[PDB]
């Protein structure tokens, strides 16, 4: 019975408009489904024109894009911090279109090893994890190609992403609508946006 109509409003001045419709069908309103961080649970919604809308009541996994290196991987959602539109939704842990998600940084480690070998984020131990780090021995000139990938491209993921990879968490901005398409899709906060949101989260934890 929710009407998003614009005929129950005041005018440009503030004079009251007289009601004469009966909240017609082409101006529907459906209640909000605040998407949690539990398991996967998506209902369907019939749309005018027979289309199908995917209502995500709670989500676990998502699809997230690294910004610079162009690597998009599947990622389990950890936590919701600093929605910056409504601080109640931070406590509620609600997924919305422009929200921030703690990416579990595990599926980027294997790609960073496979493409930018001699990796980092390995707790500064250098003795554990028999990953098959140095087993294939990199026989042909593709070892030199990986040397071009590691030294000429120089692999700089400077100290913000260094500390986040050592902590295992990563900061992400959602770019999809979880209430419309039912997907937790987003990108990784990189550089200036990353230090901006990090300053905001640090100030929020401070004061």
């Amino acid at each position: 019975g929710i009407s998003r109509d614009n005929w129950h409003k005041r005018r440009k001045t503030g004079g009251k408009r007289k009601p004469y419709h009966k909240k017609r069908k082409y101006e529907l309103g459906r209640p909000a489904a605040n998407t949690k961080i539990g398991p996967r649970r998506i209902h369907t919604v019939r749309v005018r024109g027979g289309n199908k809308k995917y209502r995500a009541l709670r989500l676990d996994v998502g699809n997230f894009s690294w910004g610079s290196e162009c690597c998009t991987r599947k990622t389990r959602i950890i936590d919701v911090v600093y929605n910056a539109s409504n601080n109640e939704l931070v406590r509620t842990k609600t997924l919305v279109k422009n929200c921030i998600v703690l990416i579990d940084s595990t599926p980027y480690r294997q790609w960073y090893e496979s493409h930018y070998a001699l990796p980092l984020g390995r707790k500064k131990g250098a003795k554990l994890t028999p990953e098959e780090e140095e087993i294939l021995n990199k026989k042909r000139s593709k070892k030199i190609q990986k040397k071009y990938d590691e030294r000429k491209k120089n692999a700089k993921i400077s100290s913000l992403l260094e500390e986040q990879f050592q902590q295992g968490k990563l900061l992400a901005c959602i770019a999809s609508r979880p209430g419309q398409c039912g997907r937790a899709d987003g990108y990784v906060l990189e550089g200036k946006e990353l230090e901006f949101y990090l300053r905001k989260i640090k100030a929020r934890k401070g004061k």
């Binding site: 614009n6 400077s158 990189e190």
Partner: protein, 153 residues
């Protein structure tokens, strides 16, 4: 600068320029849209700083439909001003005119500086930006009298 929670229109910032170590500039990757219609994009949208969703030269606001002209009356509303369109109305019985005006609101893009009260501005039809703002400021025309004058303090 920015006094909000995020301002970044379309252009991806990170080219990963870190190869030997240099600061460099950051005003180069700016989305530069030309509206067409024989109307020049001002240089404030070239070497500016503002980030606006509703700007005709920066945002995704497509200018279509009608092209009108008003006079700037008030500034006191944030990033949008109120114009006045004076016009005459022919009446069949008495066989002469009368003055009528309709004060409309219009989105003033922050590239247009020197927007002092009393100058004829050109406006263009767009999508509904808000409840009362449908037009968009297109070109500031009039110099509003004389600009040479200066006073004490």
């Amino acid at each position: 600068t920015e006094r909000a929670y995020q301002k970044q229109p379309t252009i991806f910032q990170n080219k990963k320029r870190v190869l030997l170590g240099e600061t460099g500039k950051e005003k180069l990757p700016r989305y530069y849209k030309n509206i067409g219609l024989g109307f020049k994009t001002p240089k404030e949208a070239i070497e500016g700083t503002y980030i606006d969703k509703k700007c005709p030269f920066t945002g995704n606001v497509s200018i279509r439909g009608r092209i009108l002209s008003g006079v700037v009356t008030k500034m006191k509303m944030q990033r949008t001003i109120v114009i006045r369109r004076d016009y005459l109305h022919y009446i069949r019985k008495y066989n002469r005119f009368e003055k009528r005006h309709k004060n409309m609101s219009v989105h003033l893009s922050p590239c247009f500086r020197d927007v002092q009260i009393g100058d004829i501005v050109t406006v263009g039809e767009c999508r509904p930006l808000s409840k009362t703002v449908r037009f968009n400021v297109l070109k500031v025309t009039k110099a509003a009298g004389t600009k040479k004058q200066f006073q004490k303090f």
